[PDB]
Amino acid sequence: MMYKEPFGVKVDFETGIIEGAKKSVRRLSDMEGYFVDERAWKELVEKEDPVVYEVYAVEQEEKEGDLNFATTVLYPGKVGKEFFFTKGHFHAKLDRAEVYVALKGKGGMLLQTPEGDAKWISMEPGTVVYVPPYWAHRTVNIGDEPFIFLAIYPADAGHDYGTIAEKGFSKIVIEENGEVKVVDNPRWK
Amino acid sequence: MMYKEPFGVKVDFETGIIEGAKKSVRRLSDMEGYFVDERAWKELVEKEDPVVYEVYAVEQEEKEGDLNFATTVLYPGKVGKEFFFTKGHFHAKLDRAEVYVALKGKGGMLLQTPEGDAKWISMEPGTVVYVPPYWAHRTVNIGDEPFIFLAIYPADAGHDYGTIAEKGFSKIVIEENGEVKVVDNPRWK
Ligand SMILES: O=C(O)[C@@H](O)[C@H](O)[C@H](O)COP(=O)(O)O
Ligand SMILES: O=C(O)[C@@H](O)[C@H](O)[C@H](O)COP(=O)(O)O
Ligand SMILES: [Mn+2]
Ligand SMILES: [Mn+2]
Numbered sequence: 439m440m441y442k443e444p445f446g447v448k449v450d451f452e453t454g455i456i457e458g459a460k461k462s463v464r465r466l467s468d469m470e471g472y473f474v475d476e477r478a479w480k481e482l483v484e485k486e487d488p489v490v491y492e493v494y495a496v497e498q499e500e501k502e503g504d505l506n507f508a509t510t511v512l513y514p515g516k517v518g519k520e521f522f523f524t525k526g527h528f529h530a531k532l533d534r535a536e537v538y539v540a541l542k543g544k545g546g547m548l549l550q551t552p553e554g555d556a557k558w559i560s561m562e563p564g565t566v567v568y569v570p571p572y573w574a575h576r577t578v579n580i581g582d583e584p585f586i587f588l589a590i591y592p593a594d595a596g597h598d599y600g601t602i603a604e605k606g607f608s609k610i611v612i613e614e615n616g617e618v619k620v621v622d623n624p625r626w627k
Numbered sequence: 628m629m630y631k632e633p634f635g636v637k638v639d640f641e642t643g644i645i646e647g648a649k650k651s652v653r654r655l656s657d658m659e660g661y662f663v664d665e666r667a668w669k670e671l672v673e674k675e676d677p678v679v680y681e682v683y684a685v686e687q688e689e690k691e692g693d694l695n696f697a698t699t700v701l702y703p704g705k706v707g708k709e710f711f712f713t714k715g716h717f718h719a720k721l722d723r724a725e726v727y728v729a730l731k732g733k734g735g736m737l738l739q740t741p742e743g744d745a746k747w748i749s750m751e752p753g754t755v756v757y758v759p760p761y762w763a764h765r766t767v768n769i770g771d772e773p774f775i776f777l778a779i780y781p782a783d784a785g786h787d788y789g790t791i792a793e794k795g796f797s798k799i800v801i802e803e804n805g806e807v808k809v810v811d812n813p814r815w816k
Contacts, residue, residue: 441740442759446748449728449755456755496757502691503723503781504760534692537779539638539728551630559635566638566645566777568685570631571693588755590726590779592692 447496451541454509454586459494466490466517469525471603474610474625475518482517489513490522497593504593511586512545512579519612526576526607528552530596536569536589538577543585548607548620549573556609558620561587574602578611580618636685640730643698643775648683655679655706658714660792663799663814664707671706678702679711686782693782700775701734701768708801715765715796717741719785725758725778727766732774737796737809738762745798747809750776763791767800769807 448457466479467487473479482488495508515522526548529536538547540561547567550556551574559567561577569575579585608626612619637646655668656676662668671677684697704711715737718725727736729750736756739745740763748756750766758764768774797815801808 439761441742441744441761444736444738444746444748444757444759444762446736446750446754446756449753451753496755498724501722501760503720503784505724505726505757505779505781507726507755507757531692533690535687535694535782537694537696539777547633547635549633553630555630557633559633561635564638564640565635566685566696567635568633568694568696570633571690572628572630573633588728590694592694592781593724595692 449509449588454494454511454541456494456496456509459496462493462495463489464491464525472525473517473520474623475520478518488515490515491524500594502594505590506593507588507590509586509588510577511584512577513584514579514582516613519614521578521580521611521613523576523578523611525599526574526602528574528598528601530598531594533571534592534595535571536575536591538567538569539588540565541586541588543579543583544581545577545579545585546611548576548578548609548611550607554608556607558609558611576607580611638698638777643683643700643730645683645685645698648685651682651684652678653680653714661714662706662709663812664709667707677704679704680713689783691783694779695782696777696779698775698777699766700773701766702773703768703771705802708803710767710769710800710802712765712767712800714788715763715791717763717787717790719787720783722760723781723784724760725764725780727756727758728777729754730775730777732768732772733770734766734768734774735800737765737767737798737800739796743797745796747798747800765796769800
């Protein structure tokens with residue numbers, strides 16, 4: 439058989455860039471139907487259409503037992519009162535877990551089961567987050583600077599974006615009165 | 628079903644300590660038959676029996692698709708000319724990969740296939756190492772300070788220490804004339 443070649447890659451903990459990896463870019467215009475305030479969404483697309491996040495992924499052939507890894511640079515910002523976040527997804531193989539390692543900035547993870555129960559975990563540099571089997575996961579930047587992390591996940595986990603794209607998460611993360619709040623999502627069913 | 632509880636845990640990138648995790652300690656006396664210079668090994672056990680490394684592990688029930696993670700603090704030192712290293716192991720489920728994230732110090736990984744072909748990857752802070760399916764892996768501290776890293780691995784990978792405990796790695800990492808060398812292991816067959 440072919441034994442795949444082990445390698446090291448340099449990851450800059452300040453920028454989240456993985457050398458030689460190749461940027462994927464999600465702009466706000468790529469996230470129609472995600473934010474609670476749709477008029478604020480449309481207005482911010484019209485005015486700027488900012489980058490919400492960039493991902494650098496190092497991925498293997500989809501195979502049981504193997505591992506992918508990726509950094510994300512989640513930029514600071516809000517759509518109305520709602521903080522910039524990642525689209526969020528379940529795994530296609532639902533029981534695949536994930537481990538995140540927060541590197542820079544201030545953020546957190548929203549997680550949700552298929553039954554709709556949600557949980558928020560704060561993330562600051564050094565926080566390692568265990569994303570268990572069956573939990574959808576979205577990251578949120580609650581600060582003024584990029585929120586950068588590294589995620590390691592099974593190479594056969596896949597992605598289910600569609601479920602979240604239609605129903606959302608049952609909780610949202612907003613700023614009111616200069617204070618960060620995690621509250622029920624008024625649009626969730 | 629029970630959806631396991633997501634959590635965050637704080638990892639100190641300076642000490643490698645995972646809060647609430649619980650030290651496993653490997654002393655030199657726990658590594659009989661590992662180092663090329665057995666008399667140097669015995670003498671250093673007699674004189675000090677130093678800690679070679681400590682591990683902090685956060686482990687799940689063994690289950691396909693799930694993930695464990697662990698930090699290691701590999702202390703600086705030599706047995707004769709050979710740098711302190713971890714015992715090293717294959718996975719029990721051979722095709723399970725691993726991802727390492729170097730946090731502090733200066734070190735590297737030695738990897739080996741079941742056919743005996745070895746590869747060395749240098750590790751400095753920020754280096755992420757892809758340990759592919761089928762490769763045994765050992766880390767080595769080539770510096771004067773603790774070499775600290777975080778590793779993420781499948782919860783069902785298991786460990787095969789025995790193979791390495793008998794045959795070793797086909798390469799060793801030594802200091803001669805103040806220079807670090809990776810050379811053939813004279814005791815390998
Ligand atoms: O492994 C992961 O889940 C991450 O690398 C995410 O894919 C990344 O943060 C981007 O988020 P999303 O995939 O939800 O758009
Ligand atoms: O996941 C791993 O392989 C690491 O956490 C190692 O177990 C750790 O570095 C200790 O090395 P060893 O298991 O070879 O004694
Ligand atoms: Mn994921
Ligand atoms: Mn391992």
